[PDB]
Amino acid sequence: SSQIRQNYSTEVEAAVNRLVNLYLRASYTYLSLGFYFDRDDVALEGVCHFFRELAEEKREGAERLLKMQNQRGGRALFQDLQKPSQDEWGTTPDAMKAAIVLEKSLNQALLDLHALGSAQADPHLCDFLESHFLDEEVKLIKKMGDHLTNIQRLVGSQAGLGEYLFERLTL
Amino acid sequence: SSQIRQNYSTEVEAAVNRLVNLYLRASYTYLSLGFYFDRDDVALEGVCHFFRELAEEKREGAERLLKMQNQRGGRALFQDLQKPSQDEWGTTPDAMKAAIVLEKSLNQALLDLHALGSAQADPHLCDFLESHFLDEEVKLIKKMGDHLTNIQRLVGSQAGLGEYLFERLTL
Amino acid sequence: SSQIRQNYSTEVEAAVNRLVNLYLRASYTYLSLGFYFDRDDVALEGVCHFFRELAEEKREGAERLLKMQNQRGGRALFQDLQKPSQDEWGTTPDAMKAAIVLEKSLNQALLDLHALGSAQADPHLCDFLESHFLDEEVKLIKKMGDHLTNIQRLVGSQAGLGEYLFERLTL
Amino acid sequence: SSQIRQNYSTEVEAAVNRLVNLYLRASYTYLSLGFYFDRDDVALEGVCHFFRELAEEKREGAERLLKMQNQRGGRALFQDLQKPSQDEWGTTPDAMKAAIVLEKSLNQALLDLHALGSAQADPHLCDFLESHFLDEEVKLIKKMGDHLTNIQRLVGSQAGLGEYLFERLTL
Ligand SMILES: [Pd+2]
Ligand SMILES: [Pd+2]
Ligand SMILES: [Pd+2]
Ligand SMILES: [Pd+2]
Ligand SMILES: [Pd+2]
Ligand SMILES: [Pd+2]
Ligand SMILES: [Pd+2]
Ligand SMILES: [Pd+2]
Ligand SMILES: [Pd+2]
Ligand SMILES: [Pd+2]
Ligand SMILES: [Pd+2]
Ligand SMILES: [Pd+2]
Ligand SMILES: [Pd+2]
Ligand SMILES: [Pd+2]
Ligand SMILES: [Pd+2]
Ligand SMILES: [Pd+2]
Ligand SMILES: [Pd+2]
Ligand SMILES: [Pd+2]
Ligand SMILES: [Pd+2]
Ligand SMILES: [Pd+2]
Ligand SMILES: [Pd+2]
Ligand SMILES: [Pd+2]
Ligand SMILES: [Pd+2]
Ligand SMILES: [Pd+2]
């Protein structure tokens, strides 16, 4: 039951639960990315740290969504969390590309939810997504794109040397 | 006269004045709630303080609306302020229910104004209501709902004991 | 590949991956427990906080296992994470009982892994599990049992009052 | 003579003396590695420092073993210390490979002693080796493997440049 729910559609409630699942899936993907770079035969600790930090950020995003769900009087519903798409993540450019694909997918899900909110005349949702998720995603994706460009620039010269230098000097 | 008014409809100007009246009415209701709990035959000071704090918050909301009215070049117009709905407010659950009804009414008025702003293509109004009122209302209503649930849980056990414990340990 | 793996069986490597899955599942269960207690119709914030803290602890346990996996030259392998056993968690005693069942299951998995380590003559694993997991589990389970006893004592008197008092005064 | 010896076999006493010899041999090997990298025609000071630090660590390990020998009432017996396996240590990858081989040999000797302790029902020895040697070895070997992977990655690109960069930026 709820004694507080107001202007909060079942459609938005369901979409928020799905977004929680997507954020937790992303966190899990970043956990796997991080530990892959910590392998003794990979051993790029700046890259490991970068992804471990992202795993934390995505978990925090899920938690913020869940807090909002409860603030509005909706009910959190959890589903199975699928394992990440890969067991091994290839090179640093491969990994950074995968991360961009992942963030773009989260960003599109946020845009889809916003569109739903707007269609449902739910301005609290719009404002929530704006100042807490959409700007953060744009900033993160810019950072990732910058990183990808730098590593691509480096590995076009010499791959081993380039991966080492990027990890040491950027990350 | 105004030398600054831009994209600010007479409809929004009037709705803002009405919202000021609603916020000042709410402040007055909370003043009455607060002093009822300060009666020597009621004597629940945490409850008195909770409502007195809300009286302040609602007055501050009205003042923020008035400041915005002037920033946009609209003209504040004040109307009579009707007295609160009750002279005596019953039990703590009765009072908390009344507060939730009141906040939901303010929240609906904010949503109605936002809808008007959106219909009038007035994005300053949308942004103003978002970051200054709509989030605050959602947070407050969640707090009130939490409080109501706790007091209901307590007075289902033993009413006198429950009201005392809630006032001492939550408020 | 690995250039470091020594005295680390494929059996232990696989069991460690399974234990990671169990710890991440436990973290997910505690996330769901926490947010259930944050519902406006439940509203026991000390209970929410208790479970949210446990969600963090279990995630940290998984991360420690993964770090150890890599230290030994094993390879992390992630599987799907099943959703928690319940969507709604009942009363505080119901929830605390569920938590004890969960921790006992983790403890048994640790004991099973230790037995495997001992059978595989892997003293690093034994020492790792000892000073980092087994003592922590015993301490946590004692705390949970103490909590369950207190809430049972309280709700045998009066359920609503008891749940409120436990949340306010213990948690 | 001893007035304190209890549950301490002659087999374990002898094995501890042999382990002291192995640790002192390792210290000597690291001394030679360190000074090789300090040669004016090698001149990789981060590599020199890395190995000199290890020489200290291994000497400290021997001293801890000797202290334990006396704590248990066993008698330290010293043997000749053989010179290191090489006079010149080749490239940075050559040296790091040699270090890994050396640490694996110490780790295996620790495992062999632990197995003896367990067979002799000597839990003090097990606990001593656990919290003071086995974890330290696993951590060190992981670090070495990480280093080897990085230098291999670098010298696969360009050897001179790679050796310089590793010494400057990792060490
Ligand atoms: Pd790492
Ligand atoms: Pd890391
Ligand atoms: Pd960081
Ligand atoms: Pd919007
Ligand atoms: Pd928006
Ligand atoms: Pd917005
Ligand atoms: Pd008062
Ligand atoms: Pd007061
Ligand atoms: Pd206050
Ligand atoms: Pd809007
Ligand atoms: Pd808005
Ligand atoms: Pd806005
Ligand atoms: Pd909470
Ligand atoms: Pd909480
Ligand atoms: Pd805490
Ligand atoms: Pd053991
Ligand atoms: Pd053990
Ligand atoms: Pd142990
Ligand atoms: Pd030197
Ligand atoms: Pd040096
Ligand atoms: Pd140093
Ligand atoms: Pd042992
Ligand atoms: Pd041991
Ligand atoms: Pd031990």
Curated annotation (Swiss-Prot), chains A, B, C, D:
It comes from the Eukaryota. GO terms for molecular function: ferric iron binding; ferrous iron binding; iron ion binding. Fe cation binds at E53, E56, E57, E60, E63. The modification N-acetylserine is found at S1. One of its GO terms (cellular component) is cytoplasmic vesicle. Keywords: Acetylation, Cytoplasm, Cytoplasmic vesicle, Iron, Iron storage, Lysosome, Metal-binding. GO terms for biological process: intracellular iron ion homeostasis; iron ion transport. Residues 6-155 form the Ferritin-like diiron domain. Gene3D superfamilies: 1.20.1260.10. It is found in: Cytoplasmic vesicle, Autophagosome; Cytoplasm; Autolysosome. In horse spleen the light chain is the major chain. Stores iron in a soluble, non-toxic, readily available form. Important for iron homeostasis. Iron is taken up in the ferrous form and deposited as ferric hydroxides after oxidation. Also plays a role in delivery of iron to cells. Mediates iron uptake in capsule cells of the developing kidney. Delivery to lysosomes by the cargo receptor NCOA4 for autophagic degradation and release or iron. Belongs to the ferritin family. This is Ferritin light chain.
